[PDB]
Design a protein around this ligand. Structure first.
Ligand SMILES: CCCCCCCCCCCCCCCCCC(=O)OC[C@H](COP(=O)([O-])OCC(O)COP(=O)([O-])OC[C@@H](COC(=O)CCCCCCCCCCCCCCCCC)OC(=O)CCCCCCCCCCCCCCCCC)OC(=O)CCCCCCCCCCCCCCCCC
Ligand SMILES: CCCCCCCCCCCCCCCCCC(=O)OC[C@H](COP(=O)([O-])OCC(O)COP(=O)([O-])OC[C@@H](COC(=O)CCCCCCCCCCCCCCCCC)OC(=O)CCCCCCCCCCCCCCCCC)OC(=O)CCCCCCCCCCCCCCCCC
Ligand SMILES: CCCCCCCC/C=C/CCCCCCCC(=O)OC[C@H](COP(=O)(O)OCCN)OC(=O)CCCCCCC/C=C/CCCCCCCC
Ligand SMILES: CCCCCCCC/C=C\CCCCCCCC(=O)OC[C@H](COP(=O)(O)OCCN)OC(=O)CCCCCCC/C=C\CCCCCCCC
Ligand SMILES: CCCCCCCCCCCCCCCC(=O)OC[C@H](COP(=O)(O)O)OC(=O)CCCCCCCCCCCCCCC
Ligand SMILES: [Zn+2]
Lengths: 226, 152, 141, 141, 75
């Protein structure tokens, strides 16, 4: 959005030193129990394990492929929530302009709390009036006293929580078959051999499953000076 | 005198003693004269941007000696500034309502002298020294000190 | 049937859009910089311009152009030794492209080719190329 | 340009109101739905209708304005842009050259002439009997 | 294939939208002939005022063929 500042380096990828060292437990943790860093590396390890196995991709369904990469198959419930989330974020630093509100289609006023201050400017052209500010509280269909424009408050609330991308992913995504560490090892040997590492994440991940320091050059990789 | 090069090449080689010309005519040589941390960003530069930067840098550094010459002549001029006639005290000249003490509110050194009136202060310091009070300055002949810019 | 997916970008400030599952898979695959590699194709006009900045690269780039090779720059520095493998690699990639393209729809069998000459592949993960940024001339000569 | 302007010289965030012209309209287009044909009455409003990311063009603008921040190479601007970027720098440098090779020489000549003839070479010699160099800018007399 | 050096490509045009930027009709892009005519007149006035220092103090004696009411008697 225009109100956001510049992408960080982390916005693209995370450093491999932030990979959890207990990979064996990481790949067995349920999604609802994974933190932001743990969830990043669960998806990256599992997603790259399937993508770096070309011979199996054509026989893998889009439902299974999306699960491996950690992408959520969309549906009307989740689409509604995500859309209203992105609309809330956009309105943080953007103007609020849209069609005239009526009983059939009230002006939708997203909010996290139970109230949001709103102003009615009336219709277009000569039907526009001076700003009339009012407090839009949930559970009431508001009508402007001047132009009769109907307003309504929409709350991004779900089960004692507000709506977030993390909440939407946890509520609607279902964990599939438990990730098999044999796949990690098999793909690791595929792209990492004879001092050539073409899957750096899988070389670090396999090292942790082995106990940290087992694979060649990994003790030297983990030895820091400050 | 080397005859293995042309006269033009010899002159350019000597003007390249510090490598300025080589860095202009070689991108690789310019990037490898950068410290490694900044060499990382070099590949994005255009040749237009690179040579324009060198041109601005070279013009500036080559004019610094000229400014230095102009400044030295200025120092010499001030170091031997000609005496000027003593000012007649005209209708509106040398008006004082109170002594000059804003520099030394409590000590009140040279209350009669003006802030940068060096000859008045010298005689005033001499009075203080004759009164057993030490003051600094106005005792060494100019030609017997360094950086005076008044030596023949 | 291809399902729609949510694709999110950013770490702390996250922007979510809808996207194609296959397009996202390709996007992540191209992010594997060690596996999927960009390769350069030259033309005579650009090869000549290279000489203005690196004479050695011009000669090596000319060899690549003469053989119509799409070559990585790191490999290009060793084209003198890698040329026989590069020519063999070119043939195998072409064979594979032809086989997959000509196959009937719904036939996703792997192509038959010699993977030992194609890099990067499991069969040949490449060579440990030595840095060539070492001066070899005496300034006093 | 030096000064930052949100609309034109927005270098702090790099936001651009419209997509690159290189992109086909089918891929990305400027966010402009002012020409939308009248909606049929039997169509029903599903979305909010509010100007925002529900519109495809606006969504793609936000997405691109964030994913454009990482690029494999530089987008070389043309020489006109490069000249404008350092217009003041180049002009000041030429001003310094003028001050050294134009102002310098004639100022020296005037002082040397003044030494011999008491007044600069661009002044009217006085007969009043007053002494000294007198004015220098004769056109402000 | 054929390519174009980016340094010599032309400037990209403003996008054509509901909100379009257009400077073509302003005529503020560069100094025009009128500006250079102002400079020429300034140089001329500067030289004239110095060369002919009695111009501001003219002579009231006037003959004027065809009298004073003829057009060439006003310049
Ligand atoms: C901050 C210092 C300001 C000093 C102002 C002084 C003004 C007077 C004239 C000075 C003329 C020299 C140039 C000054 C401009 C700046 C130069 C510059 O940018 O250097 C960058 C250069 C490298 O900078 P960098 O950041 O590493 O690289 C920047 C570029 O990327 C890469 O840079 P580059 O390679 O493109 O170089 C740019 C180039 C641009 O400059 C030019 O080409 C200008 C040429 C002017 C010619 C004038 C004739 O400059 C040079 O080549 C500078 C060469 C300096 C070599 C100094 C070596 C040590 C000398 C030690 C002397 C010791 C004497 C002891 C005597 C004892 C007696 C008892 O800096 C230095 O090497 C540091 C020194 C800078 C110059 C100091 C000059 C001092 C002069 C003292 C004279 C004393 C005379 C005593 C006589 C006694 C008789 C009895
Ligand atoms: C007597 C003593 C005079 C001392 C003058 C001191 C000047 C210091 C700054 C010089 C400097 O670096 O200028 C170059 C530099 C050139 O800017 P650039 O963006 O590289 O220009 C690109 C092109 O020239 C093409 O640029 P562009 O034409 O596309 O437009 C971009 C540029 C165009 O502007 C400039 O470039 C400004 C150049 C100024 C040169 C002055 C000589 O815009 C700005 O930089 C705007 C700066 C903010 C201006 C705010 C004005 C506030 C006061 C407004 C009036 C309020 C009272 C009204 C009362 C009556 C009511 C009826 O100027 C600045 O960036 C400085 C802007 C701020 C100056 C504030 C001065 C006090 C007001
Ligand atoms: C067939 C066609 C041939 C045409 C030939 C054209 C020849 C033109 C020659 C022009 C020579 C001009 C010389 C100017 C010398 C000025 C020297 C001077 O004043 O030095 C000191 C002065 C500063 O003095 P201060 O003591 O600080 O006092 C002033 C400030 N307080 O220093 C400067 O001004 C520095 C700049 C010096 C510039 C010298 C310019 C020389 C120009 C040569 C041009 C040659 C052109 C040849 C053309 C050939 C075409 C076939
Ligand atoms: C901050 C500013 C600090 C300024 C420190 C220097 C002040 C200074 O030099 O002031 C003297 C200067 C020149 O005056 P005279 O000495 O009479 O000139 C005779 C020349 N022989 O002007 C003044 O006296 C005014 C000083 C005003 C207060 C300055 C400090 C604030
Ligand atoms: C706060 C103080 C500021 C400084 C002093 C301000 C002084 C007043 C304002 C001046 C501003 C000028 C800015 C430059 C504009 C510019 O160059 O503007 C340039 C314009 C031309 O525009 P173009 O560049 O588009 O051609 O010049 C003109 O319009 C004039 C063209 C030449 C005319 C020649 C003949 C003139 C005859 C005049 C006779 C006068 C007789 C008077 C009798 C009493
Ligand atoms: Zn209203």
């Amino acid at each position: 959005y225009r109100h956001w500042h510049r992408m960080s380096e982390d916005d693209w990828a995370l450093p491999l030193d932030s990979m959890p060292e207990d990979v064996k437990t990481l790949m067995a943790t349920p999604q609802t129990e994974r933190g932001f860093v743990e969830d990043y590396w669960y998806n990256r390890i599992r997603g790259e394990a399937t993508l770096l196995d070309p011979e199996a991709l054509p026989s893998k369904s889009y439902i299974a492929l999306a699960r491996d990469m950690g992408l959520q198959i969309v549906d009307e419930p989740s689409s509604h929530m995500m859309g209203l989330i992105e609309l809330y974020e956009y309105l943080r630093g953007a103007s609020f302009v849209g069609p005239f509100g009526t009983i059939e289609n009230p002006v939708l006023v997203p909010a996290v709390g139970q109230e949001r201050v709103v102003a009615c400017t009336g219709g277009v052209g000569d039907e526009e009036h001076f700003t009339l500010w009012f407090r839009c509280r949930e559970g009431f269909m508001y009508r402007c006293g001047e132009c009769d424009q109907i307003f309504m408050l929409v709350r991004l609330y779900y089960e004692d929580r507000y709506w977030t991308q993390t909440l939407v992913r946890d509520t609607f995504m279902s964990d599939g078959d438990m990730f098999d560490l044999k796949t990690l090892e098999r793909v690791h040997k595929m792209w990492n051999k004879d001092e050539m590492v073409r899957w750096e994440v899988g070389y670090w991940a396999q090292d942790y499953v082995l106990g940290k320091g087992v694979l060649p050059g990994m003790v030297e990789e983990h030895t820091r000076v400050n | 005198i080397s005859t293995s090069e042309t006269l033009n090449q010899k002159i350019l080689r000597w003007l390249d003693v510090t490598g300025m010309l080589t860095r202009w005519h070689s991108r690789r040589e310019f990037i490898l004269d950068m410290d490694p941390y900044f060499r990382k960003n070099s590949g994005m530069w255009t040749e237009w941007e690179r040579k324009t930067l060198l041109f601005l840098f070279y013009c500036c550094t080559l004019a610094t000696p000229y400014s230095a010459y102009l400044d030295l002549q200025e120092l010499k001029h001030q170091g031997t500034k000609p005496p000027r006639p003593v000012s007649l005290e005209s209708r509106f000249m040398n008006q004082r309502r109170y002594d000059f003490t804003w520099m030394h509110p409590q000590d009140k050194f040279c209350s009669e002298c003006r802030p940068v009136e060096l000859e008045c202060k010298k005689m005033c310091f001499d009075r203080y020294r004759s009164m057993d009070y030490r003051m600094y300055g106005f005792q060494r002949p100019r030609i017997q000190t360094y950086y005076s810019f008044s030596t023949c | 049937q291809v399902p729609d997916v949510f694709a999110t970008f950013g770490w702390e400030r996250r922007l979510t859009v809808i996207h194609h599952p296959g397009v996202m898979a390709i996007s992540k695959l191209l992010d594997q910089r060690t596996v999927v590699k960009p390769r350069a194709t030259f033309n005579q006009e650009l090869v000549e311009e290279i000489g203005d900045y690196d004479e050695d690269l011009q000669r090596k780039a000319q060899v690549a152009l003469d053989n119509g090779l799409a070559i990585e720059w790191r490999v290009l520095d060793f084209i003198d030794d890698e040329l026989p493998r590069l020519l063999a690699e070119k043939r195998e990639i072409e064979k594979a492209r032809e086989q997959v393209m000509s196959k009937a729809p719904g036939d996703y069998t792997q192509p038959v080719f010699d993977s030992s000459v194609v890099v990067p592949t499991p069969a040949n993960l490449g060579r440990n190329y030595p840095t060539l940024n070492l001066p070899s001339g005496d300034p006093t000569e | 340009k030096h000064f930052f302007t949100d609309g034109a010289n927005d270098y702090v965030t790099g936001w651009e109101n419209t997509p690159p012209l290189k992109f086909p309209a089918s891929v990305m287009k400027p966010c402009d739905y002012s020409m939308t044909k009248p909606i049929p009455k039997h169509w029903k409003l599903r979305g909010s209708g509010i100007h925002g990311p529900e519109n495809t063009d606006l969504m793609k603008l936000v997405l691109w304005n964030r994913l454009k921040q990482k690029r494999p190479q530089r987008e070389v601007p043309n020489i006109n842009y490069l000249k404008d970027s350092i217009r003041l720098e180049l002009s000041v440098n030429w001003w310094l050259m003028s001050c050294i090779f134009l102002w310098g020489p004639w100022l020296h000549w005037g002082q040397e002439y003044q030494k011999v003839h008491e007044q600069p070479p661009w002044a009217m010699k006085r007969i009043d009997g007053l002494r000294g160099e007198g004015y220098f800018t004769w056109f402000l007399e | 294939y054929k390519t174009e050096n980016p340094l010599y490509k032309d400037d990209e045009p403003f996008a054509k939208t509901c909100h379009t930027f257009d400077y073509t009709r302003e005529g503020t892009e560069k100094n025009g002939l009128g500006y250079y005519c102002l400079m020429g007149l300034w140089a001329s006035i500067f030289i004239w005022d110095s060369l002919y220092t009695g111009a501001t103090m003219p002579t009231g004696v006037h003959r004027y063929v065809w009298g004073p009411y003829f057009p060439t008697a006003w310049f």
